[PDB]
Amino acid sequence: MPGTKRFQHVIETPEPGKWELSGYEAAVPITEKSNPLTQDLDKADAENIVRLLGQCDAEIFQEEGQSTYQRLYSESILTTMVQVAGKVQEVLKEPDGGLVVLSGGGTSGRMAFLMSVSFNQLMKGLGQKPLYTYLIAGGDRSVVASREGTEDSALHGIEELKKVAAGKKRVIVIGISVGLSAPFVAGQMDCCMNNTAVFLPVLVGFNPVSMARNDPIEDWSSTFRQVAERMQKMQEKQKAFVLNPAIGPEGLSGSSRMKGGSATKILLETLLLAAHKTVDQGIAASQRCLLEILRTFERAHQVTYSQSPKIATLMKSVSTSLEKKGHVYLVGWQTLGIIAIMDGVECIHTFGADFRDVRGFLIFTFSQEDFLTSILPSLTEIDTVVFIFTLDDNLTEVQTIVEQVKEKTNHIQALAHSTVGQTLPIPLKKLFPSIISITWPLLFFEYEGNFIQKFQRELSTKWVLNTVSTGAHVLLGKILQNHMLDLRISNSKLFWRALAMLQRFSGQSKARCIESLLRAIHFPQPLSDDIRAAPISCHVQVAHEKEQVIPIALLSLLFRCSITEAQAHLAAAPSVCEAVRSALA
């Protein structure tokens, strides 16, 4: 039948009560699962939200129970991290013709970028040629933009990989896809396995390979699952690797920018730092060297979330400023500035939020006076401005901007990272009455930019901003249980996630859910056979431009009404969320 090719793989909606027993729940990839910790996130207050996401984040470091999926601290995974460290060493020994590519779409792409900078710094600080580079779905502009549509082409990913791998002789490609999902990465990994004399593929993600994405890619014959399965078979001969610990579901279902992006740093910084810091000691990388770093990253979670009450309070002030109709500014220096930008941009697709809503700023890259002349004018009594810096930064360039922002604002708070026994100049740095001082132990660093201190701080800021940005929006009522219902379908994965959210919330068949979705997308056109049979990219291109696609589709289903009837209903309701929630009642 028309459409059967495209929707065949979709699992049927189970009867009420048999979601487990149908085996439906066991085929939801971990990365898409509803986190049971966060069943009631939409009812939690700011302090609970901070507690619940701190807990969700902590699952990255939880160990394997006694029939179950490997985790970060399991022997299989640490052994894989060691062997990969190994192969990275081979390349560092022979820098002529060597390269190390870190590649990903969206937030994996963003994380790849940071890491490639950091490790390129490390080799410069030592007077070696930089061997690292990144690749991101949609070219370099994607690092700092919302561009969710660019991950769906495998030919594109292969193309970018051909550019950068030039006339190199030995290339390590670290394909990062949290969901073992992105067609961008799938093609790179497959290309690598076709030329193993040159390429070494290393796939990173957080699902077991049996849960790796398995629906057809438009411009490629194999699926992510097949690719990953074959890489795993190559791992026995040490010519591909899959690094895939389970880290438990996201506190917001499928929001892999959060735990996923965190775990990607933890995992890859750990393993590359080990490889570097042990080549020059003329010593193989070992589980013990990795563990030191992992445990440090795990302290960093504890350290970070010990500031929870203040994290909640910043959340309440980001949420207030948006409940009214103001903006939120994230102002930071070096790498922490970048991360601020990344958090703000992600809010666009993640929450349906305007680029002004939560904007990041590096001292997007506007200098000291430039910020004071350009941006400072537009600030307002109800806004919120967040300063994010270390004490090693240049605190004259900092205090100035706060002195000034104070006049027009008052809702300021800050995020200051410090070694123990550094002191915050101006005892009236109040200015910031009740800062978020994150104060780090003295650790034993030996490379000269103190890279482990950088990684701690990056990660800790990520956790704070993510929890803040995400929390603020949940308080505003935009999240249904722990799902973002009203998302914008801008790629195939998101189209599938809409469909799943329809099955779950309505309890109705896959055929009806698909019909309602496609009707909602293509309204005012009716469902023809061509539309039914169209590749998923055609539905994405049309949905991408609309508003409220998913809630209109769910209302059509709940009320068993037309798209004309459900648009009328929505428009007659005080708000999308009330329309949906009361229709669910």
Ligand X SMILES: O=P(O)(O)OC[C@@H](O)[C@@H](O)[C@H](O)[C@@H](O)CO
Contact set with ligand X (CB under 6 A): 104-108, 148, 151, 177-179, 181-182, 255-257, 346, 349-350
Among 41-49, 55-63, 204-212, 429-437, which window interacts with ligand 2TF (CB under 6 A)?
204-212
Residue number, 379 or 513, with CB nearest to ligand 2TF: 513
Cα 219 from Cα 158, distance rounded (Å): 11
Among 163-171, 211-219, 294-302, 555-563, which window interacts with ligand 2TF (CB under 6 A)?
211-219
Per-residue exposure over 459-479, b if at least 16 CB sit within 10 Å of its own CB, e if not:
bbbbbbbbbbbbbbbbbbebb
Are 493 and 179 in contact, with CB atoms under 8 Å apart?
A: yes
Selection from ligand X, ligand 2TF, none that 499 binds (CB < 5 to 8 A by kind) is ligand 2TF
Tell me whether residue 493 is annotated as binding. yes
Cα 123 from Cα 126, distance rounded (Å): 5
CB of 570 to ligand X, least distance (A): 26
Residue for token pair 């104070």: 406
Residue number, 30 or 115, with CB nearest to ligand 2TF: 30
Instruction: Tell me which of 33, 239, 512, 544 binds ligand 2TF, using CB under 6 A.
Output: 33
CB of 479 to ligand 2TF, least distance (A): 13
Q: Is 29 in the site for ligand 2TF (CB under 6 A)?
A: yes
By Cβ distance, which residue is nearest to ligand X?
A: 106
Cα 245 from Cα 280, distance rounded (Å): 29
Tell me whether residue 178 is annotated as binding. yes
Cα 259 from Cα 101, distance rounded (Å): 22
DSSP 13-68: PPPTT-TTTTTTGGGS-GGGPPPGGGTTTTT--HHHHHHHHHHHHHGGGPPP----
Cα 346 from Cα 467, distance rounded (Å): 13
Selection from ligand 2TF, ligand X, none that 108 binds (CB < 5 to 8 A by kind) is ligand X
Selection from ligand X, ligand 2TF, none that 182 binds (CB < 5 to 8 A by kind) is ligand X
Cα 496 from Cα 565, distance rounded (Å): 25
Q: Is 504 in the site for ligand 2TF (CB under 6 A)?
A: yes
Per-residue exposure over 290-313, b if at least 16 CB sit within 10 Å of its own CB, e if not:
bbbbbebbbebbeebbebeebbbb
CB of 180 to ligand X, least distance (A): 7
CB of 13 to ligand 2TF, least distance (A): 10
Per-residue exposure over 235-245, b if at least 16 CB sit within 10 Å of its own CB, e if not:
beeebbbbbbb
Instruction: For residue 412, give every residue at least 6 positions away whose Cβ sits within 8 Å of its Cβ, in sequence order, or none.
Output: 384, 385, 386, 387, 402, 405, 406, 432
Specify the DSSP class assigned to residue 393: S
Which alpha helices (DSSP H) does 126-258 contain, by range?
154-164, 183-194, 224-235
Q: What are the φ/ψ torsions at residue 146 (nearest 5 degrees)? A: -75, 105
The strand pair at 412-419 and 436-440 is best described as parallel
Which x/- pattern, by CB under 6 A, does the window 159-198 give for ligand 2TF?
--------------------xxx-----------------
Tell me whether residue 449 is annotated as binding. no
Q: Is 112 in the site for ligand 2TF (CB under 6 A)?
A: no
**53, two tokens:** 């996401």
Tell me whether residue 151 is annotated as binding. yes
CB of 147 to ligand X, least distance (A): 9
Are 277 and 451 in contact, with CB atoms under 8 Å apart?
A: no
Instruction: Tell me which of 35, 142, 253, 255 binds ligand 2TF, using CB under 6 A.
Output: 253
CB of 149 to ligand 2TF, least distance (A): 14
Selection from ligand 2TF, ligand X, none that 29 binds (CB < 5 to 8 A by kind) is ligand 2TF
How many residues belong to the site for ligand 2TF (CB under 6 A)?
24
Q: Is 499 in the site for ligand 2TF (CB under 6 A)?
A: yes
- In the annotated binding site, the residues are 107-108, 151, 177-179, 346, 493
Please report, as ranges, the residues that interact with ligand 2TF according to CB under 6 A: 10, 28-29, 31-34, 179-181, 207, 211-213, 215, 253-254, 493, 496-497, 499-501, 504
- In the annotated binding site for beta-D-fructose 6-phosphate, the residues are 107-108, 177-179, 493
